[PDB]
Every structure is written in C-alpha cells, then in structure tokens.
Symmetry: C3
Subunit: 231 residues, 3 copies
Amino acid sequence: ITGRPEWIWLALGTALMGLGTLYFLVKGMGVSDPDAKKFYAITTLVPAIAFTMYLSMLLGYGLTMVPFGGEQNPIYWARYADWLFTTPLLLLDLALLVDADQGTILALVGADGIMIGTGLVGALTKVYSYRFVWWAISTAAMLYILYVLFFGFTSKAESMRPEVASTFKVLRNVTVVLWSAYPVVWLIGSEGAGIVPLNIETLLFMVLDVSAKVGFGLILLRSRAIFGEAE
Amino acid sequence: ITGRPEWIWLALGTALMGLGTLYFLVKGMGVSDPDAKKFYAITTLVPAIAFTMYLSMLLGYGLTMVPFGGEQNPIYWARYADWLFTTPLLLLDLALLVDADQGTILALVGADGIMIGTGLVGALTKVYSYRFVWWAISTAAMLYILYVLFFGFTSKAESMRPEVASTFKVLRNVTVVLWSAYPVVWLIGSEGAGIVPLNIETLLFMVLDVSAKVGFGLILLRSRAIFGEAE
Amino acid sequence: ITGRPEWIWLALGTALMGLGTLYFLVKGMGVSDPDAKKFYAITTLVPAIAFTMYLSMLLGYGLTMVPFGGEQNPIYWARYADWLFTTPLLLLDLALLVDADQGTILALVGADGIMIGTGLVGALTKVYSYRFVWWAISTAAMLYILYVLFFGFTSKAESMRPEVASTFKVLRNVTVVLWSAYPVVWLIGSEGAGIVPLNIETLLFMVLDVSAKVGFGLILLRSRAIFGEAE
Ligand SMILES: CC(C)CCC[C@@H](C)CCC[C@@H](C)CCC[C@@H](C)CCOC[C@@H](CO)OCC[C@H](C)CCC[C@H](C)CCC[C@H](C)CCCC(C)C
Ligand SMILES: CC(C)CCC[C@@H](C)CCC[C@@H](C)CCC[C@@H](C)CCOC[C@@H](CO)OCC[C@H](C)CCC[C@H](C)CCC[C@H](C)CCCC(C)C
Ligand SMILES: CC(C)CCC[C@@H](C)CCC[C@@H](C)CCC[C@@H](C)CCOC[C@@H](CO)OCC[C@H](C)CCC[C@H](C)CCC[C@H](C)CCCC(C)C
Ligand SMILES: *C/C=C(C)/C=C/C=C(C)/C=C/C1=C(C)CCCC1(C)C
Ligand SMILES: *C/C=C(C)/C=C/C=C(C)/C=C/C1=C(C)CCCC1(C)C
Ligand SMILES: *C/C=C(C)/C=C/C=C(C)/C=C/C1=C(C)CCCC1(C)C
Ligand SMILES: CCCCCCCCCCCCCCC
Ligand SMILES: CCCCCCCCCCCCCCC
Ligand SMILES: CCCCCCCCCCCCCCC
Ligand SMILES: CCCCCCCCCCCCCC
Ligand SMILES: CCCCCCCCCCCCCC
Ligand SMILES: CCCCCCCCCCCCCC
Ligand SMILES: CCCCCCCCCCCCC
Ligand SMILES: CCCCCCCCCCCCC
Ligand SMILES: CCCCCCCCCCCCC
Ligand SMILES: CCCCCCCCCCC
Ligand SMILES: CCCCCCCCCCC
Ligand SMILES: CCCCCCCCCCC
Ligand SMILES: CCCCCCCCCCC
Ligand SMILES: CCCCCCCCCC
Ligand SMILES: CCCCCCCCCC
Ligand SMILES: CCCCCCCCCC
Ligand SMILES: CCCCCCCCC
Ligand SMILES: CCCCCCCCC
Ligand SMILES: CCCCCCCCC
Ligand SMILES: CCCCCCCC
Ligand SMILES: CCCCCCCC
Ligand SMILES: CCCCCCCC
Ligand SMILES: CCCCCCCC
Ligand SMILES: CCCCCCCC
Ligand SMILES: CCCCCCCC
Ligand SMILES: CCCCCCCC
Ligand SMILES: CCCCCCCC
Ligand SMILES: CCCCCCCC
C-alpha cells in the first residue's frame, strides 16, 4: 500500500468519509419527520459509497494501468464508480429541496450519467488525442447541469419557503464552484496532459470530494429546510 | 478509423443522433408544462445516449474481439450499453402516454432489462451453439413486452384522451415493427449465423436505431398528447 | 458442463427458478387490482433474473478464476449480478407491504447495494487477508438492513391491516433467517476460508436462493395482503 506516494491522501480520504458517514448516521437517529428522513438517507449514503471506493483505491483494487503516450499510466477507475452513484444523489438533494418537477430531475440525472460515463470512457481510452474528445463531451454535460441549477432551480427556490431558498442558494453556490474544479484537475492531471503529478492530483480530488460530500452534507443537515413546516 | 468498412455507417449514425439530440434540446426550450417536460426529458436523453455510444464505436472503444467458430469475431458491445438505457426510456415514453400503473411499468422495464442483458451475454458467449440459447431467452422477453404493449396498453389508451389514444397507437405500431427487426438482424448477422456481413449489419442497425429513436421522437414531440389538457 | 461436480446443483437451481417464474407468471394473469399487480411484477421478476444467472453459471459464462492463496480459485461472479437486482426487489416487496416512507426505502436499497457491491469486490480481491475486510463491511451493511426490518418496519406493520401485519411478520422472519446464512456460507466456502468445498457450497446457496425467492414468493402471493381493501 505504502509503495504508492499518493497512499497518504487515499488513507486520509477513507478516514474522513468513514467519519462523515458515522456522524450523519448518528445524527439522523433522532429523526421521524418523513421529509427529513429523505434528506438524511440521501446524504448519509453519499459518503458511505465514497468510503468504500476510497478504500478500494487504498488497497489497490480500484486502480488499473492504461497504455497511452507510450507509457503504462496508473488510472484510478474507482472514482467513476463512486461518482456514478454519488453525483446523482447530490443532485437529488438539491432537486428535492426546491420540489423540482419530475422531468427536470430526469434531465439532471441523465445528463449527470452522461457526464460520468463519458469521463470514464475518456479515462480508459488508449488513443491519447481521443481522451480529450470525451473530456469535452463530459464537460458539455456538466455545463448543462450547471445551467439548470441556475436558470431552472434558483427561480424555483424563490417561490418556496425562505429557509429552503436560502439553504438552496448556499448549496447551489458550493456545488457550482466545487464541481467545476473536477474537469480542470482531470485535464492537467495524470488522466489528461500530465502536468500535475498523480500524488498532487490525488490530494486535490480528496479535498474536493470531502468538501463536496461531507462539507455539503454538514450545511444541508443543519438546516431547518429539510423539515416539513410543522407546528 | 477508416480501416473498418463499416465506419461510414457508424459516422452517419453518430451525426444523425447528434443532430437529433440538438433538435430536441432546442425544441424543448420553450416548454413550461410539467407533463410535456417529462416527455422532452425522456425523449432528448435517448439520442444523446445513443450519440455517445455510436461515437465510442466509431473511435473503436466500443468494439471487442470474441473467439467463436475458430475465429476472432468483431463484436460491438457498446450497442448493449446504449440499449440498456435507451430501450427502457422508450418504453417509459409509451407507458406515461397511457398513464400505465406502476406494476405494469416495472414489468416492462424488468423484462426489457432481461432482454438486453441476455442479448449481451449471447453476444459475448464463446460456445457457438449457446449463443442461440441466449438469443431465444432474449426473444421471449421481447415477446412479453410486445404482448403487454398490445393487450395491456392499447385498451388502456382507448379510455384516455383521443389525442393520446391516436398518438399511442401510431407509436405502438412503429415500436412493434422496428423492434421486431433487431433479433432478426442479430441472428443473421455477425453475432449469429454470419450470413450478412458486418458492414451491412451495421447499416441495418443504424437505420433501425435512427428510426426507433429520432423517428419515434419526431412523432411524439409534435403531438399535443404530451401536454396536459389546459385552457 | 458436467466437468464440474457442482453442475448438478446449478442445473437444479436453474430448473426450480424457471418453474417458479412460470408459476408466478401464470398465477398473475388473472389480476387487475393495481396494488396486487405491483407485488406480482416485483415477485415474478426475482426468479426470472435468478433463472438467467443460474443458467449462465451452468453454461460456464458466469465463472471466473481468481488468484489467491497461490491457487486459481473458481469464483462464480454471476451470483452478485443476480443479487444486485433481486435483493433490492425482495426488500421492495417488504417495504411496499408496510407502506414504508421513501427515505426508508432509499436507505434500504442503498445499504443493500453497498452490501452486494462490497461482497463482489471481496470475491474478486487477490490479496487474501483483504477479502475478509470487504466481507466485514458487507456484513455491517447487512446488519443495518436487518435492524431496519425489525426496528423501523415491524412497528409500522402493526398500525396497518391485520392481514398485512401478519404476512409482513412471517416474511420478515423468513428473510432475516435466510439472509443471515449467506455471509456464513461465503466465509467458510471457496470465497473465504475454503473449509467447505465448492460443490457443497453451491448446494447450500441453491437451497437458500430457492427458499428466499420462490419460497418467499409463494407465501406473499397467496396472501390477501397484496390486494387493496375492496368490497
Ligand atoms: C439514464 C442515465 C443512466 C444514462 C447513462 C449515460 C451513459 C449511457 C453514458 C455512457 C455509459 C457507458 C460509457 C458505460 C461504459 C462502461 C464501460 C466503460 C465498462 C468498462 O468496459 C470498457 C472496456 C474496457 O475499457 O471493456 C472491454 C470490453 C468488454 C467485453 C465490455 C463488455 C461489457 C460492457 C461494459 C457491458 C455494458 C454494460 C453497461 C455499460 C453498464 C453501465 C456501467 C456504468 C459505467 C454506466
Ligand atoms: C430490473 C432489471 C434491471 C433486471 C436486470 C436483468 C438482468 C439480470 C439480466 C442479466 C444482466 C447480466 C447478464 C449482466 C452481465 C454483465 C456482464 C456481461 C458484464 C461483462 O462481464 C462478462 C465477463 C466477460 O464476458 O466478465 C469477465 C468476468 C469478470 C470478472 C466479471 C465480474 C464483474 C461482473 C460483471 C459484475 C456484475 C455487475 C452487474 C452485472 C452489473 C449489470 C451490468 C448491466 C449489463 C446489467
Ligand atoms: C445506490 C446504490 C446503488 C449504491 C451502490 C453501492 C456501490 C457503490 C457499492 C460498490 C459498487 C462497486 C464496488 C462496483 C464495482 C464493480 C466492479 C467489481 C466491476 C468489475 O471490475 C473490477 C476489476 C476487476 O476485478 O475491473 C478491472 C478494471 C476495469 C478497467 C474496470 C473499469 C470499469 C469499471 C467497473 C466501471 C465502474 C462502473 C460501475 C462500478 C458500475 C456498477 C456495477 C455494479 C456492480 C454496482
Ligand atoms: C463527490 C464527487 C463529486 C461531486 C464529483 C464530481 C465530478 C465531476 C463534476 C466530474 C466532471 C468531469 C468532467 C466534467 C469532464 C472530465 C472528467 C470528469 C469526470 C472529471
Ligand atoms: C434504440 C435501440 C433500440 C430500440 C433497440 C432495440 C433492440 C432490441 C429490441 C433487441 C432485441 C434482441 C433480441 C430480442 C434477441 C437478440 C438480441 C437482441 C438484443 C438484438
Ligand atoms: C436471492 C438471493 C438472496 C436473497 C441473497 C442474499 C445475499 C446476501 C444477504 C449476501 C450477503 C453477503 C454478506 C453479508 C457478506 C459476504 C458476502 C455476501 C455478499 C454473501
Ligand atoms: C482548480 C485547481 C487546479 C490548480 C492546481 C494547482 C496545483 C499546484 C501544485 C503545483 C504543481 C506541481 C508541479 C510540480 C510537480
Ligand atoms: C429485417 C431485415 C433482415 C433482412 C436483411 C436483408 C439484407 C439483404 C442484403 C444482402 C445480403 C448480403 C449477402 C451478400 C454479402
Ligand atoms: C449456515 C450453514 C453453514 C453450515 C454448513 C454445514 C455444511 C456441512 C457439510 C459438511 C462439510 C464438508 C466438509 C468435508 C468435505
Ligand atoms: C447510472 C446510475 C443512475 C442511478 C443513480 C441513483 C440515483 C437515482 C436517483 C433517482 C432520482 C429519481 C428520478 C425520478
Ligand atoms: C438496468 C438499467 C435499468 C434502468 C434504466 C433507466 C430507466 C428506468 C425508468 C424507470 C421507470 C420508473 C419505474 C417506476
Ligand atoms: C444497483 C441497482 C439498484 C437498483 C435495483 C433495482 C431495484 C430498485 C427499486 C427502487 C425502489 C424505489 C425507490 C424509491
Ligand atoms: C453556462 C451555465 C452558467 C453557469 C455555469 C458556469 C460555468 C463554469 C465553467 C466551469 C469550468 C469547466 C471547465
Ligand atoms: C405475441 C404478442 C403479439 C404481438 C407481438 C408480435 C410478435 C412479432 C414477432 C417478432 C419476431 C421476432 C423474431
Ligand atoms: C442487529 C439487528 C438485530 C437483528 C439482526 C440479527 C443479526 C443476525 C446476525 C446474522 C449473522 C451474520 C454473520
Ligand atoms: C493530443 C491533443 C490533441 C488535441 C485534442 C483536443 C480536442 C478537444 C476537443 C474540444 C472540442
Ligand atoms: C450451432 C447451432 C445449434 C442450434 C442451437 C439452436 C438453439 C435455439 C434454441 C431455441 C429453443
Ligand atoms: C488471513 C486472514 C487475516 C485476518 C483478517 C480478518 C479481518 C476481519 C476484519 C473484521 C473487523
Ligand atoms: C454500521 C452498522 C449499523 C448497525 C446499527 C444501527 C445504527 C443505528 C441506525 C439507526 C437508523
Ligand atoms: C473510523 C476510522 C476509519 C478509518 C479507516 C480507514 C483509515 C485507513 C487507515 C490506514
Ligand atoms: C453536429 C454534427 C455532429 C457530427 C459529429 C460526428 C460525425 C463524425 C464525423 C467524422
Ligand atoms: C421448464 C424447465 C426448465 C429447465 C431448463 C434448465 C434445466 C437444465 C437442464 C440441463
Ligand atoms: C465548502 C466548504 C464547506 C464547509 C463545511 C462547514 C460546515 C459547518 C456547518
Ligand atoms: C418510422 C419512421 C418515422 C418517420 C419520422 C417522420 C417524422 C415526421 C413527423
Ligand atoms: C422458507 C420456506 C418457505 C416455504 C414455502 C412454502 C410455501 C407454501 C405456501
Ligand atoms: C462520530 C460519532 C458522532 C457522535 C455524536 C455526535 C452528536 C450527534
Ligand atoms: C452566499 C453563499 C456563498 C457560498 C460560497 C461558498 C464558496 C465555496
Ligand atoms: C461560479 C464560479 C465558478 C468558479 C470555478 C472555479 C474552478 C476552480
Ligand atoms: C439543430 C438546431 C435546430 C434549430 C431550431 C429548429 C426549430 C426549433
Ligand atoms: C396507423 C399507424 C401506422 C403506423 C405504421 C408505421 C410502420 C413503420
Ligand atoms: C406487427 C408486424 C411486425 C413486423 C415484423 C417485421 C420484422 C422485420
Ligand atoms: C407451471 C404452470 C402452472 C400451471 C397453473 C397453476 C395454477 C395457476
Ligand atoms: C411466525 C413466523 C415464523 C416463520 C419462521 C420461518 C423460519 C424459516
Ligand atoms: C433471527 C435468527 C437468525 C438465525 C441465523 C441463522 C444463520 C444460519
């Protein structure tokens, strides 16, 4: 395990996701409100899935070698397995907060699936120049998602409770900033142009992942917006 | 890319799915009705997914070699990845049109999953005679789906709005004819008996795919059946 | 096929799932009640999926070799493909019976996904001692599911119809006993410590699978709890 310099960040990531999972699990024990239960379920599952995939990367299972540029390049494929399930759960948290219509939710989840799926294909593609074609398609799917979060959701939040409108606005802003960093790190890291070494890349993704999951969850689950308006 | 004679049909397929995706995306921009949004979301996602998988076939990612009959046989596995997601979306379009009950929808999607999954296993099976066992099981799942579309849905459409009944009937008929061709092409093509060469097989699937997705979508999204009855 | 001593149990399993599938399919033909249709759909799909995966194991497709302990160890990976889809369907049968809230259903299905997914990783892991780390995480996800079935569902059933409360209690008890055997068989069988040989392991899983699917389904589909209260 320690044979890879990036192991320290995989281990820290595993620990922080594990701790985040346990914290949300305990916190949600005292919850009976049916609406709050939905948000706790979604939000606890996110770091639990990430915990398993960080562990698989730490132990070496979630790593494969991909030939491109005349080299055997270490590619952590387990990231995409994580993201396939956790990024639509994160979007679902946002969509339920603002009572999004079903068509909009399906558009978001579908675009998200395309985003992660094409990122996976790009990560595993052996023809170097083609990796960036997949990156571009994935990034276009991301831009669609960000567009919807701003010009379909923000003006939906404003007709809702003030506490859900303010909580949505904060989580929207956190999401757009954090999620936009992922394609940049991929592009300059070992999957793309290879300018930033894998150990630093792994650190960067770990900070983004913990912030986008445990950070996000801490903000959401401390808000009164997750509860039905009750006396 | 041009090293494979079937590349021209993969390229045309990619282009037509891409163009179809953009057309539906633009067309649905001016839509606020919650019901119509569902149909636009579902129907736009279908060629978008197909676009990505056609591209993966064009670039060579979605192709593998399978030993059977003492030969290395080129198998485009990306078709099944496409179909796994797009065929239940197509069925969902039909089921929502007639306000199908939840049990019926689950039966359809489940049978569809079995249909595509067993087709994939058959496509990748190395014992030649066993490929046709999987083809038979998949075809039985197809026949179940077609049965339900006729003797569970058609008489559901007739108690609904005339515009939804007439639109459903047309899309049902398009679906049954087009979908029934797929097992025949598989059986006589490079996956099955090998009587029709891969380049012609690829052409045939491209015509079926564009018709079943973009053709289907053009009929559906031009109907007033996708809108709630409103003043 | 007969080259593997466990083939007889794979063949019997295939037959019993096939027969169970046909029986439930015929039985549900005379059903119009929308609630009952849901239970028939879910419950018929379960042995149908299991039939396909038992067949893939019989024909040899669903088997791979995994190096650990200095040996090539036969691992039937198709079990996890089965279980990935059938165990959440089984939980859905239980959850719908007691009209579980959406948050609880998502927690169950999510924990179940983690349970099966980590079992799959453990089954395919090449470092022997690490296989048991994945077994432990999977078992913890199982224990969560069993906890919810007892201390979240049982007291939900009691405020419902007596026929649904009594049917739920029986199916809950069947589920907890049968499902708890699976991690034990894995641990002592060819995936784990290797004390029980593969042919006996295969027998054990076949008895558990038929009981947990066809047995379970026979109890559920003969109950009046699956019908809406109607005059
Ligand atoms: C509604 C939304 C969910 C829409 C989803 C959007 C989605 C369509 C976007 C594209 C997804 C698609 C790229 C998934 C591809 C998975 C694939 C990378 C798995 C690895 O297999 C690739 C090659 C080795 O590189 O296998 C070597 C050759 C092997 C023989 C491969 C044969 C097995 C195939 C992988 C079977 C395909 C199954 C499905 C792709 C399962 C989807 C997995 C998940 C990653 C989407
Ligand atoms: C409700 C509905 C959805 C019901 C669904 C119906 C469904 C049950 C029908 C059968 C689906 C099942 C056949 C999927 C099999 C996928 C498999 C072909 C992927 C390729 O792996 C096959 C061999 C190489 O040929 O791998 C070589 C050996 C490797 C070590 C394989 C180990 C990895 C396994 C593939 C893990 C299994 C994961 C699940 C099958 C994911 C499902 C993928 C999708 C195609 C259904
Ligand atoms: C809401 C709930 C559903 C939550 C779900 C919980 C879930 C997160 C729990 C963990 C699931 C995760 C372990 C699935 C891993 C599948 C993996 C074993 C498939 C086989 O690939 C493993 C190695 C060979 O051993 O591939 C060799 C290297 C290859 C290059 C691998 C590259 C292809 C990757 C497999 C692509 C990943 C796609 C997704 C994992 C699809 C999920 C399949 C299913 C088994 C969950
Ligand atoms: C918890 C993990 C999260 C929130 C991950 C988010 C990841 C993305 C938004 C990834 C986006 C990518 C692209 C837009 C193109 C390049 C490849 C990706 C997959 C890194
Ligand atoms: C957009 C793509 C569509 C509508 C594809 C439909 C495909 C089928 C109905 C495929 C059916 C098959 C069988 C019935 C058995 C042989 C294998 C298949 C998968 C080709
Ligand atoms: C129809 C099949 C059923 C009901 C299978 C149930 C399987 C399980 C509950 C498996 C549990 C496992 C663990 C808890 C850890 C070890 C690995 C598994 C996957 C066997
Ligand atoms: C969105 C953030 C992307 C920028 C990442 C900056 C990383 C700077 C680290 C120094 C680069 C290491 C190069 C020498 C090894
Ligand atoms: C459902 C349509 C299946 C029939 C396809 C007919 C294809 C005819 C093309 C000629 C066959 C090529 C054989 C000589 C290369
Ligand atoms: C939950 C049941 C697990 C116990 C399984 C008992 C199997 C006993 C069979 C005898 C073991 C075979 C060892 C000699 C080959
Ligand atoms: C490819 C995996 C996509 C599914 C991820 C799980 C999250 C799905 C959330 C469903 C949202 C509800 C839509 C109506
Ligand atoms: C194996 C992939 C199956 C899922 C495909 C996505 C479409 C699912 C549509 C869900 C229909 C709603 C059922 C209640
Ligand atoms: C990884 C596969 C998980 C999906 C299995 C299919 C069963 C899903 C049942 C959905 C229950 C409804 C939740 C709201
Ligand atoms: C186009 C929608 C406006 C809100 C999205 C902001 C786009 C940020 C760009 C992210 C950088 C990705 C490379
Ligand atoms: C049995 C249901 C009647 C409607 C379905 C028509 C079946 C068409 C056969 C398709 C050919 C597949 C090989
Ligand atoms: C902790 C919840 C109480 C009900 C679950 C009973 C646990 C049975 C243990 C199963 C054995 C697995 C190794
Ligand atoms: C070796 C790099 C070749 C450049 C490929 C860039 C493709 C980016 C596509 C953006 C439309
Ligand atoms: C080499 C071909 C052997 C014939 C197999 C046909 C099987 C079809 C099954 C239909 C019930
Ligand atoms: C070779 C076996 C080494 C023992 C591993 C047991 C790990 C079990 C983890 C339970 C917390
Ligand atoms: C990680 C295993 C958890 C089993 C005990 C249940 C914890 C309490 C959860 C309350 C919903
Ligand atoms: C509760 C702490 C969980 C941390 C387990 C994984 C950390 C890796 C240590 C090497
Ligand atoms: C908008 C046109 C999209 C076409 C891109 C793929 C066509 C392949 C050209 C070689
Ligand atoms: C209807 C009987 C189904 C049995 C088919 C599979 C049994 C395997 C026989 C070798
Ligand atoms: C993006 C950083 C999130 C910070 C989380 C802090 C949570 C405290 C309530
Ligand atoms: C099956 C062929 C479909 C033809 C689509 C034409 C759409 C015009 C409205
Ligand atoms: C766990 C054993 C189940 C027994 C099923 C018998 C069904 C008869 C109604
Ligand atoms: C990591 C366990 C958290 C302890 C409880 C925190 C207050 C709910
Ligand atoms: C008003 C919300 C500001 C949140 C910005 C957080 C940036 C990481
Ligand atoms: C809305 C601001 C987006 C900031 C992008 C930051 C990418 C590192
Ligand atoms: C391909 C872009 C379509 C242009 C608009 C067509 C009329 C909505
Ligand atoms: C009355 C509907 C006829 C549609 C037939 C289309 C055949 C491709
Ligand atoms: C309902 C008519 C079906 C026609 C099947 C055509 C197969 C090529
Ligand atoms: C296996 C076929 C079952 C025959 C009908 C049983 C009574 C519904
Ligand atoms: C009162 C229900 C008892 C069911 C026990 C079944 C054990 C297999
Ligand atoms: C509730 C009793 C569980 C029995 C476990 C049996 C495991 C073989």
